[PDB]
């Protein structure tokens, strides 16, 4: 057969047309993320810089990241439904496995994880009134992209090689709540005791949420009439975006924004490698 | 047949023994809420009264309430699995419908919703170090009870009368996220614009979370060295539990604690009435 490229272009053409051929799973998710983007646009509309700014801006970010995480749970489905067709198409030998996996990842995951990221950023970014800079809009755009691919990558890494969607679905939901708690919002990651504060790093929405509130708090200011640079007899005040970040425990240096993305892409490569090894090890089990 | 009591005692004996006869759905949920109670006990262990106290205490409460809400999603199952046995047992006429419904509610819902409430309160209430008063422990106990029965009541009200668990499951998950946002944590309910701030009241974890942070913040204090009664040149400080409650928008008067429970029990009676009317209207459809 053909070596590498023509077969992934051809199988990616098949499943890509299959996604274009099925408006149900596509357009259902598209209208959900559009109307959900509108509702988050309505509730949080025009984020003020009052005292109530911080917990409102850090609210919506904690929604979106975590939204993307469970919006990856549908990506459990894509390797489990066609599993009999996968093993039948491998025992006949239609393809190479890396060509299959990199092809199917081009078909469903790469475009469908792009759409709610760009739709969310474009319709909630200006209703909410986040930072008017264009690059910050790009960092939010790309950040929701990466956290969608990484949560989806974990969904593939756990999902691939099983016949039942439901047990992997419950197992993914349990690991996403145990990663939900270790985001910045719900525990204050600094004051965990040290013998289990190490496992912050296994949490994907800390990477997403930490980036999305790194690029968006960093210039801000949150107490009207209080300049709060060298703040005096308000201590305890949390009247910048810096003080909320450091008090949250996030590297205010510009590398601390992008190490979230390197940790993201590292989790993408490791998780897809785990799914890849599951396919090479279960391809002959069949 | 017997009028009212012997038949609900007898059917409640049947399904109650059926729950004792099935260790899977019972003891699986029991070990999940025990080990999850332990993990929340470990992460938040010894809640300090530093600056980081508030968002940590208001973290765990927002978990538990919301946990109970999706821990009610399993209660979608209990009227949909036995639906063919329900319609077959009604066309034969084994029982009265109010005797069936009040009997089955005694069988599964009333004991199984008691257990993760009392287990959660007893194992996380002293690891975390919430208020040492015994009545506050009782209000948390009863509050998690009521929010479990009410979220489960909504799960019955949507669930009853359908054959497919999954569409009602997705529909319940969507209404629980849209009630999640309108809790106190994630939006600051005061600063919603008035044309959709009215629908706060349709949210069940506002009732649960509002009670659980009414009985638990109310005596507290959160800035070390700052007494903050008649607080001066810290404004903006949030150095009580009162200022977090009022700034969150919660009636600091003692009726404001219990109107959450009246709203709860009102939602229990209305939601179970809706499921009851669904059973009387679908009992002959069959």
């Amino acid at each position, epitope marked *: 057969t053909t070596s590498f490229c023509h077969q992934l272009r051809w199988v990616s053409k098949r499943s890509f047309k299959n996604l274009l051929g099925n408006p149900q799973a596509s357009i259902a998710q598209i209208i959900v993320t559009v109307v959900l983007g509108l509702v988050i646009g309505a509730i949080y509309f025009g984020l003020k810089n009052d005292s109530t700014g911080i917990q409102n801006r850090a609210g919506v970010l904690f929604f979106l990241t975590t939204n993307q995480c469970f919006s990856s749970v549908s990506a459990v489905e894509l390797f489990v439904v066609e599993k009999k067709l996968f093993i039948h198409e491998y025992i006949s030998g239609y393809y190479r496995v890396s060509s299959y996996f990199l092809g199917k990842l081009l078909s469903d995951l790469l475009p469908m994880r792009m759409l709610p990221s760009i739709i969310f950023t474009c319709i909630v970014y200006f209703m909410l009134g986040l930072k008017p800079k264009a690059d910050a809009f790009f960092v939010m755009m790309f950040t929701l992209m990466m956290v969608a691919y990484s949560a989806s990558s974990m969904a593939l890494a756990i999902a691939a090689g099983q016949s039942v969607v439901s047990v992997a679905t419950l197992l993914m939901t349990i690991c996403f709540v145990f990663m939900m708690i270790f985001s910045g919002l719900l525990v204050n990651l600094t004051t965990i005791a040290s013998w289990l504060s190490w496992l912050q790093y296994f949490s994907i929405p800390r990477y997403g949420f930490t980036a999305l509130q790194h690029n968006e708090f960093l210039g801000q200011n949150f107490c009207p009439g209080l300049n709060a640079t*060298g703040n005096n007899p308000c201590n305890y005040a949390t009247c910048t975006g810096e003080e909320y970040l*450091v008090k949250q425990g996030i590297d*205010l240096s510009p590398w601390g924004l992008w190490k979230n993305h390197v940790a993201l892409a590292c989790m993408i490569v490791i998780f897809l490698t785990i799914a890849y090894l599951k396919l090479l090890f279960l391809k002959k089990y069949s | 047949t017997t009028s009212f009591c012997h038949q609900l005692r007898w059917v409640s004996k049947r399904s109650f023994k059926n729950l004792l006869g099935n260790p899977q759905a019972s003891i699986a949920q029991i070990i999940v809420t025990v080990v999850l109670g332990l993990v929340i006990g470990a992460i938040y262990f010894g809640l300090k009264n530093d600056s980081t106290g508030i968002q940590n205490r208001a973290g765990v409460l927002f978990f538990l309430t919301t946990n109970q809400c999706f821990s009610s999603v399993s209660a979608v199952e209990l009227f949909v699995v036995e639906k063919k046995l329900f319609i077959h047992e009604y066309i034969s006429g084994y029982y009265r419908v109010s005797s069936y419904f009040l009997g089955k509610l005694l069988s599964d819902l009333l004991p199984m919703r008691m257990l993760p409430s009392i287990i959660f309160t007893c194992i996380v209430y002293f690891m975390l170090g919430l208020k040492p008063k015994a009545d506050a422990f009782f209000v948390m106990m009863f509050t998690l009870m009521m929010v479990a029965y009410s979220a489960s009541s909504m799960a019955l009200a949507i669930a009853a009368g359908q054959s497919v668990v999954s569409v009602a499951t997705l529909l319940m998950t969507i209404c629980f996220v849209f009630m999640m946002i309108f809790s106190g944590l994630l939006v600051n309910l005061t600063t919603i614009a008035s044309w959709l701030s009215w629908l706060q009241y349709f949210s069940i974890p506002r009732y649960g979370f509002t009670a659980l942070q009414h009985n638990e913040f109310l005596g507290q204090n959160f800035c*070390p060295g*700052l007494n903050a009664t008649g607080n001066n040149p810290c404004n903006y400080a949030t150095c009580t539990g009162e200022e977090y409650l009022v700034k969150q928008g919660i009636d600091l008067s003692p009726w404001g604690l219990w109107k959450n429970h009246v709203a709860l029990a009102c939602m229990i009676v209305i939601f179970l009435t809706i499921a009851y009317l669904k059973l009387l209207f679908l009992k002959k459809y069959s």
Partner: antibody, heavy 118, light 106 residues
């Protein structure tokens, strides 16, 4: 505020030592948080721990299980006891007064040397 | 969070400007007090909030810097200002001080 602590000038090793910082000027339960700070022979400093006005305590996590700070509200006193001492803990000790909304240890005791010796 | 106050000694003559640089290990965000310990006394508070100054001082003292670098700067270093100066973060418990800097007279 005017602070003055007083106690022994010695303790045997592997015992406990107690000090008392009599406070005149405020009440211990009125406003500030109340604090203990050692100082090694020579230069180095080490914040030990505060009991605030409402009786909650916070201790330097190097000194786990070994320090305890108590409160006697009527005489305006607050006490340290340091259990299982070591001749390392030969140090000048200080009681100091932490404002909270300014953040800085504004007032300090005058100081007493404590020598763990055999 | 450990501070790192380097160097621990200076020998600058009278009436001069001298510069002390406290370097944190994380961000401490202007939560940095300077203390001014004499020989034989308790550390008196000198600079609160890393810019301001407690009343009762000759106002020749100037705390600058942000990020992680902080700096006490003394214009016209007098006789009284020899001592040991301890930076002290108070961003988070435990409140580690610095190693101190013993000034000297030329």
């Amino acid at each position: 505020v005017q602070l003055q602590e007083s106690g022994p000038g010695l303790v045997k090793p592997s015992q406990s030592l107690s000090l008392t910082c009599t406070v005149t000027g405020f009440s211990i339960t009125s406003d500030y948080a109340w604090n203990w700070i050692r100082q090694f022979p020579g230069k180095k400093l080490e914040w030990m721990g505060y009991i605030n006005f409402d009786g909650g305590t916070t201790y330097n996590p190097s000194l786990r299980g070994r320090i305890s700070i108590t409160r006697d509200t009527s005489k305006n006193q607050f006490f340290l006891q340091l259990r299982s001492v070591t001749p390392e803990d030969t140090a000048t000790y200080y009681c100091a007064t932490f404002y909270g909304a300014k953040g800085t240890l504004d007032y300090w005791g005058q100081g007493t040397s404590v020598t763990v010796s055999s | 969070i450990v501070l790192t106050q380097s160097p621990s000694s200076f020998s600058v003559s009278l009436g001069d400007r001298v510069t002390i640089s406290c370097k944190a290990s994380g961000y401490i965000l202007n939560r940095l007090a300077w203390y001014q310990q004499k020989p034989g006394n308790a550390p008196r508070l000198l600079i609160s909030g890393a810019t301001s100054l407690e009343t009762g001082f000759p106002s020749r003292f100037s705390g600058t810097g942000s990020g992680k670098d902080y700096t006490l700067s003394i214009s016209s270093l007098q006789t009284e200002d020899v001592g040991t100066y301890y930076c002290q973060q108070y961003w988070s418990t435990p409140w580690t001080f610095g190693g101190g800097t013993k000034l000297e007279i030329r």
